[PDB]
Amino acid sequence: GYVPKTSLSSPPWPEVVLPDPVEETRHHAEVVKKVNEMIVTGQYGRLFAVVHFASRQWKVTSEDLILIGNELDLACGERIRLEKVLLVGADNFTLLGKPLLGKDLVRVEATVIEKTESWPRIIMRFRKRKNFKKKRIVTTPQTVLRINSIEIAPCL
Amino acid sequence: GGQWRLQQGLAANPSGYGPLTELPDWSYADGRPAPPMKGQLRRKAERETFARRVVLLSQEMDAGLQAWQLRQQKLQEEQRKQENA
Amino acid sequence: TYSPLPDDYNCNVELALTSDGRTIVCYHPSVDIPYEHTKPIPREEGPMIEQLSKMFFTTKHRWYPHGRYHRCRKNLNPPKDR
Amino acid sequence: TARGTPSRFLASVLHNGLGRYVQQLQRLSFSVSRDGASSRGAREFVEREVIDFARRNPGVVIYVNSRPCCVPRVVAEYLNGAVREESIHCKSVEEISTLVQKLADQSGLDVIRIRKPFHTDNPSIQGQWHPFTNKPTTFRGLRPREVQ
Amino acid sequence: LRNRVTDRYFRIQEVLKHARHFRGRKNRCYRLAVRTVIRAFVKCTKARYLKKKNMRTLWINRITAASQEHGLKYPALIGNLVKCQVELNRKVLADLAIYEPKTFKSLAALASRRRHEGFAAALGDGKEPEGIFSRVVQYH
Amino acid sequence: RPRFVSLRAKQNMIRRLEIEAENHYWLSMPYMTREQERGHAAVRRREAFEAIKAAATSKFPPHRFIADQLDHLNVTKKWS
Amino acid sequence: SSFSRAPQQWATFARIWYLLDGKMQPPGKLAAMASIRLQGLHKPVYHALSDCGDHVVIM
Amino acid sequence: KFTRSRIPEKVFQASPEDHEKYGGDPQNPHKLHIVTRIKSTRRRPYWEKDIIKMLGLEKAHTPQVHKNIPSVNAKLKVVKHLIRIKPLKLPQGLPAEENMSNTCLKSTGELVVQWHLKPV
């Protein structure tokens, strides 16, 4: 089934040979051990985290502020743990969940810094030549959270 | 990636059923679980009603088949019993 | 020897799965610029608008003034973030 | 509309949540009337709920002034100097309670459009992107088409 | 004139206050202001859809730029991240691209790794074991 | 002006046709026969209609309370 | 990272100079590349109002 | 004129090839349909609109469980071009009263009676 080397004889993309599974698994173990040792020795500075809260994903870091568009049924100044942390990343390494990281790995903590109402939003409907005109004002409840700390544990 | 998610057996929409949307969003720093989310409660109620309807329909169809079988048995046994003379 | 991406720029990326296979670890130390890849430090209205346009590679239109209406509509104390 | 209204950025007063949470509301002032249907709800609130609220929020000084007035009011003064005046005219006890609790939980910042739902003082941990990130370097830093 | 309206000043001001930042007589004359203020409010109401639409378009453009910086294409990146079960949304992906270039490069490497793992599976379909990053975590 | 069918439109139509073919297949195999199903839901249907009839016939003005009438006197409640 | 505010902003929003060689190249593909670079759609910090375009020199 | 369409019965007579393709055995037929409205009833005849309302498929992409019996099948035949029908699969049998509150309908069409929301 040999084909002389022409423009269309071979695919236009480079041939990629993936590493053999056994050696690659050993390499993964080595890399995971290295990152775990970094976590053990605390060789990281700021930690950021993609956390799924409410219905959205927030890129978060310590001292950050987040504006949830609804009341959370929590007293102001109350401390909370954000549990759906999709990603935790540092200067030299990042950990990705599938799709969520375990509780033992990451601990994102926040505090209900404020409870407020949004500025009046105007909902106007209008249709020409139909005497159809309506106006409504809505103030969506909101909660400001401050992210206090992001902790990781050597549980890889 | 709706098609791939369907192939793997997950919801086509990641916002659908699964750990990402079913699990509680948060809990108290102490460790106490948070009160169930309104969406989670609504979803649980809807799923319970769906399961109850599934059970009701299955039971009704099974009872109908059993009743039909009993009717056939009664008709045949009666027509046989008529042979008495 | 297989590399997911060229390792020359912006960091050396190393992907891995934990033993359980439920989380992905990425080790991406930044790559420093080699010393050999560096060089030693060396040691009227019309004409004005044409000069400015040539200097900043823009058009003449943005160098003409604006009316009092816009100059006063402009917010002089805009909100500042971070 | 946003374009016909001031806006600000999501922010706290003094990094209110970092070290400890400090209730931003500091003063409540209920102007109420002995007589007048308008302030019936305010009178019932003062009778039943104001003491409980005061003890629940020890950091807020609550003044209750009974003077003849047609529209009873509550003036909330926050630590950052903000003053928000809300009429409790013809509001029921539960309505007044919810309004007062909202004032207590709210910060002094103006209730205007907030540009972003978030605020980071350190948006980047690995270094903000710039055109030369992801660009490989060359030997002796030679620009393209450079003879030497 | 038994009953005569006395609030007309405030009734007019309720609209003129919103009209104050318009051009021409639309900001002064009520007859003209009311028509334009109604249009302004209708546009504000309808703009909440376009804001969301453009944010996703902006996020998609930024992600396309970031992925092209690594030789990937946006469809490949998104599809392969989904296949790897990384449920990061476009907003977060654009934020990472702008502010976490190393993390974004790691994610692009994962996507390309999956995209090549995908292709090896297609070539030698069947006997070949599932790729290391192609293995799917099952929830029950 | 003439309009023309693109490969994307053809693929969309083919996808819909495949879904409908699967629908045909799954409808081709009933569980019960018509004689078997006859009357198997009569009791439940009758109970549902009885509930509907009861709801329709239970329509009547609501009660009126001396407490509701007299509470209006509170509009002039004052402090002595 | 660790830059001062003004240098960081200047670096992020600086405009780079790119070189395209048009020899035997289709003008359409050259124009696609040049238009992406000119608009700045090749930058993750892109925005229509940020004036983030770059310089393209086609020879 | 445009009128109701009478589908010939041979359309709903599966063949062995169809059985192999779709993975359903003519013997031991499934009991329950899962029907989802994947098409709008707008621009469709009022009788199709009415059948959709009867089957309770007003909301699109919202599965509804129905009996796999001749009358329901006749209605589903009337509105077949607007819906997706899949057999309801019960790997752990129909839910018991104990686990009635922990059920979940997978995209595969399976009603699982446990929903632990944890990795396997």
From Swiss-Prot, chain B:
Superkingdom: Eukaryota
Gene Ontology biological-process annotations: mitochondrial translation; translation
Primary location group: mitochondrion
Keywords carried by this UniProt record: Mitochondrion, Ribonucleoprotein, Ribosomal protein, Transit peptide
Basic and acidic residues composition bias: residue spans: 76-85
MF (Gene Ontology): structural constituent of ribosome
Coiled-coil zones: none
Any single Gene Ontology cellular-component annotation: mitochondrial large ribosomal subunit
Similarity remark: Belongs to the mitochondrion-specific ribosomal protein mL52 family.
Protein name: Large ribosomal subunit protein mL52
Gene this chain is encoded by: MRPL52
Residues of the full protein shown: 24 to 108 of 123
Curated annotation (Swiss-Prot), chain C:
Organism: Homo sapiens (Human)
Full protein name: Large ribosomal subunit protein mL42
Subcellular locations according to the entry: Mitochondrion
Top-level taxon in the UniProt lineage: Eukaryota
Record's keyword terms, sorted: Mitochondrion, Ribonucleoprotein, Ribosomal protein, Transit peptide
GO MF entries: RNA binding; structural constituent of ribosome
Gene: MRPL42
Oligomer status and interactors: Component of the mitochondrial large ribosomal subunit (mt-LSU). Mature mammalian 55S mitochondrial ribosomes consist of a small (28S) and a large (39S) subunit. The 28S small subunit contains a 12S ribosomal RNA (12S mt-rRNA) and 30 different proteins. The 39S large subunit contains a 16S rRNA (16S mt-rRNA), a copy of mitochondrial valine transfer RNA (mt-tRNA(Val)), which plays an integral structural role, and 52 different proteins.
GO BP annotation list: mitochondrial translation; translation
Swiss-Prot record, chain F:
Molecular function, one GO term: structural constituent of ribosome
Chief location: mitochondrion
UniProt keyword S-adenosyl-L-methionine present: no
Location(s) in or outside the cell: Mitochondrion
Alphabetically ordered keywords of this record: Mitochondrion, Ribonucleoprotein, Ribosomal protein
GO cellular component entries: mitochondrial inner membrane; mitochondrial large ribosomal subunit; mitochondrial ribosome; mitochondrion
Record has Coiled coil as a keyword: no
GO biological process assignments: mitochondrial translation
Disulfide topology: none
Subunit field text: Component of the mitochondrial large ribosomal subunit (mt-LSU). Mature mammalian 55S mitochondrial ribosomes consist of a small (28S) and a large (39S) subunit. The 28S small subunit contains a 12S ribosomal RNA (12S mt-rRNA) and 30 different proteins. The 39S large subunit contains a 16S rRNA (16S mt-rRNA), a copy of mitochondrial valine transfer RNA (mt-tRNA(Val)), which plays an integral structural role, and 52 different proteins.
Homology family: Belongs to the mitochondrion-specific ribosomal protein mL63 family.
Protein name: Large ribosomal subunit protein mL63
Native source organism of the sequence: Homo sapiens (Human)
Swiss-Prot record, chain H:
One GO process term, biological-process aspect: mitochondrial translation
Record's keyword terms, sorted: Mitochondrion, Ribonucleoprotein, Ribosomal protein, Transit peptide
GO cellular component: mitochondrial inner membrane; mitochondrial large ribosomal subunit; mitochondrion
GO molecular function terms attached to this record: structural constituent of ribosome
Main location: mitochondrion
Localization annotation: Mitochondrion
The protein's assembly and partners: Component of the mitochondrial large ribosomal subunit (mt-LSU). Mature mammalian 55S mitochondrial ribosomes consist of a small (28S) and a large (39S) subunit. The 28S small subunit contains a 12S ribosomal RNA (12S mt-rRNA) and 30 different proteins. The 39S large subunit contains a 16S rRNA (16S mt-rRNA), a copy of mitochondrial valine transfer RNA (mt-tRNA(Val)), which plays an integral structural role, and 52 different proteins.
Record family assignment: Belongs to the universal ribosomal protein uL30 family.
Protein name per Swiss-Prot or TrEMBL: Large ribosomal subunit protein uL30m
Species this protein is from: Homo sapiens
